[PDB]
Amino acid sequence: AMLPISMSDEGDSFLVKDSLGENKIPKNPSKVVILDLGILDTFDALKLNDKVVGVPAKLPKYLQQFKNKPSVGGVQVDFEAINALKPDLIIISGRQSKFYDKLKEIAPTLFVGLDNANFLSSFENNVLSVAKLYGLEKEALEKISDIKNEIEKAKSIVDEDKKALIILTNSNKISAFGPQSRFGIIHDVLGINAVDENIKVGTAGKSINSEFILEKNPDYIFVVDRNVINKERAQGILDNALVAKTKAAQNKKIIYLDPEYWFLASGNGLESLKTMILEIKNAVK
């Protein structure tokens, strides 16, 4: 299990430990550089927009209120821009853990990792830890309750005898993903059963083809199409007689998920996580 963020109050600051290291973070930080899009959404949802001084502007359609913040990268980190903003806090997730030592020379750097084996507990701890910095625990607990209620509404309507498959299409490559993966919340949080519970743990997933999809005969197929960031599109990759024969194709349950949520992994967002939960619920209702 990923080590959680723990914080102890030391008056003007918190002593913060997370899986990457320890930091003294000032209370109410006022110049925050955020490289994780999900946590940027949570800043919005907690009304902390004025605390943010840098984002990866090179930005999905749901985060356009930050389009005029100074750019610190693309998700490609620009260290010069970061230093020149003189931040009092840098927030990162998985995709930037490789940059940790360099960012930490600039300013205290908080890791809000999403644990693919314990998604909801990581999500809660990330949101509540950011809130504690600002004394917003009450407000963050109300919104965390809203998301839990949405998960319960979504779970309530899932069919126990149907099975789904998750795939990522990248140009013409198809790769399968299962429980406890980067897309795992379809199986792990919303309880939708998988066609294969034993695809191997790892970020690149398992290479598959249409024969595989036919062999599994999924009731639903969830597609994360990284071609939508061209020409070739999952719909054409799956435009064939193998995929056509599948229960998913026959009942028009090939679901194309918005990659600006799923591929960019905005699970740390109070509002973005909600939109993802609703997107699943509305596909299988």
Residue numbers in the entry: 22 to 79, 81 to 97, 99 to 252, 255 to 310
From the paper:
The periplasmic binding protein (PBP) CeuE1 is an important component of the Fe(III) uptake system in Campylobacter jejuni, a commensal Gram-negative bacterium in the avian gut, but a common source of food poisoning in humans. CeuE, an integral part of the CeuBCDE ABC transporter of C. jejuni, is responsible for capturing Fe(III)-siderophore complexes in the periplasm for delivery to their respective inner membrane transporter. C. jejuni does not itself synthesize siderophores, but capitalizes on their secretion by other bacteria, such as E. coli. Here we report a combined solution and structural study of a series of synthetic tetradentate analogues of the enterobactin-derived bis(2, 3-dihydroxybenzoyl-L-Ser), to explore the ligand-binding promiscuity of CeuE, both wild type and with mutations of the Fe(III) binding residues H227 and Y288.
To probe the relative contributions of His227 and Tyr288 to Fe(III)-siderophore binding, site-directed mutagenesis was then used to replace the side chains of the two Fe(III)-coordinating amino acids with non-coordinating side chains of similar size. In addition, the double mutants H227L/Y288F and H227A/Y288F were created. All five mutants (Y288F, H227L, H227A, H227L/Y288F, H227A/Y288F) were crystallized in their apo form, and all structures are closely similar to that of wild type CeuE. However while there is clear electron density for the Y288F mutation in its three structures, H227L and H227A are located in a flexible loop region and there is generally no electron density to confirm their presence. Mutation of the Fe(III)-coordinating tyrosine led to a drastic drop in binding affinity in both the single (Y228F) and the double mutants (H227L/Y288F and H227A/Y288F), with Kd values above 1 μM. Site-directed mutagenesis of CeuE revealed that Y288 is essential for binding, as the binding affinity observed in the fluorescence titration experiments is far weaker for all mutants containing Y228F when compared to the wild type protein. This finding is confirmed by the lack of CD signal corresponding to the Λ-configuration when Fe-5-Lic is added to these mutants.
